[PDB]
């Protein structure tokens, strides 16, 4: 019943920072006597219990066996670039294409996220990113984990995208 969210993008764009901040504002303890400790932590977003994973392909993950498994298991993807890192924006299309290939689907819930929007050293304009998102047919939102701008909205929007997809498949 859980929604499986995956945060994907180039190294250093802020995927961990986004995910940590989301957990901080949304985790709760749940009573569940069927498990040994009787309580588990869970994240609830827009009324849905959500699982959270980060997909990174560089650094230590250059050595990982798990990339395609992350893509197959995830139900919706936050595709993150940083607004001060043009290469990270150029890398988005590769991630999206790989996800569509691995999932063998043209309809994969996704949201495009331009993180670090607090920074004054912008090299990716809001319009370039909006054009990309429009080509994909997905929402685009700018975020900052420093000011908190957009962070909740990015994940809430992804949850709605997944919900609408699950409604259609049903
Ligand atoms: N200015 C700014 N820095 C950020 C933001 N989000 C993350 N960072 C910083 O960017 C660096 C990389 O973040 P991290 O979460 O490790 O990125 P990941 O490699 O994509 O998981 C760290 O120094 C973070 O503090 C943001 O919204 N604004």
State the Cα–Cα distance between residues 6 and 143, nearest whole angstrom.
17
Question: Is the minimum distance from the CB of 16 to ligand 1 under 6 angstroms?
Answer: yes
Report residue 75 as tokens.
Answer: 């139900």
Does residue 144 line the site of ligand 1, with CB under 6 A? Answer: yes
- In the chain, the number of structural domains is 1
What's the resolution in A? 1.2
Question: Are 5 and 51 in contact, with CB atoms under 8 Å apart?
Answer: yes
- From the CA of 115, give the closest atom in ligand 1: 27
| Nearest one of 82, 91, 23 to 53, comparing CA atoms | 23
Domain that holds residue 127: 3-169
CB contact at 8 A, 14 and 59: no
What is the residue with the minimal CA distance to atom 17 of ligand 1? Answer: 14
C-beta of 122 in contact with ligand 1 (< 6 A): no
Q: What is the CATH number of the domain that holds 154?
A: 3.40.50.300
Identify the residue whose C-alpha is closest to ligand 1 atom 7: 14
For 22, the token pair is: 């989301």
User: Residue 3 Cα, ligand 1 centroid: separation in angstroms?
Assistant: 25
Q: Name the residue of 8, 9, 11, 12 to mutate for ligand 1: max ligand atoms within 8 A of Cβ.
A: 12
Strands 110-115 and 140-142: parallel
Using an 8 Å Cβ cutoff, are 109 and 75 in contact? yes
Q: How was this structure determined?
A: X-ray
Q: Is residue 15 helix, strand or coil? A: helix
């Amino acid at each position: 019943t859980e929604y499986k969210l995956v945060v994907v993008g180039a190294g250093g764009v802020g995927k961990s920072a986004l995910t940590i901040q989301l957990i901080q504002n949304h985790f709760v303890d749940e009573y569940d006597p069927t498990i040994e400790d009787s309580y588990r932590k869970q994240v609830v977003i827009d009324g849905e219990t959500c699982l959270l994973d980060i997909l990174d392909t560089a650094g230590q993950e250059e050595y990982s066996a798990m990339r395609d498994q992350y893509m197959r298991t995830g139900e919706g993807f936050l595709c993150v670039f940083a607004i001060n890192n043009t290469k990270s924006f150029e890398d988005i299309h590769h991630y999206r294409e790989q996800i569509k290939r691995v999932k063998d689907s043209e309809d994969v819930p996704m949201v495009l996220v331009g993180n670090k929007c607090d920074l004054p050293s912008r090299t990716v304009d809001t319009k370039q990113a909006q054009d990309l998102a429009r080509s994909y047919g997905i929402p685009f939102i700018e975020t900052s984990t420093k000011t908190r701008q957009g962070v909740d909205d990015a994940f809430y929007t992804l949850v709605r995208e997944i919900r609408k997809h699950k409604e259609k498949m049903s």
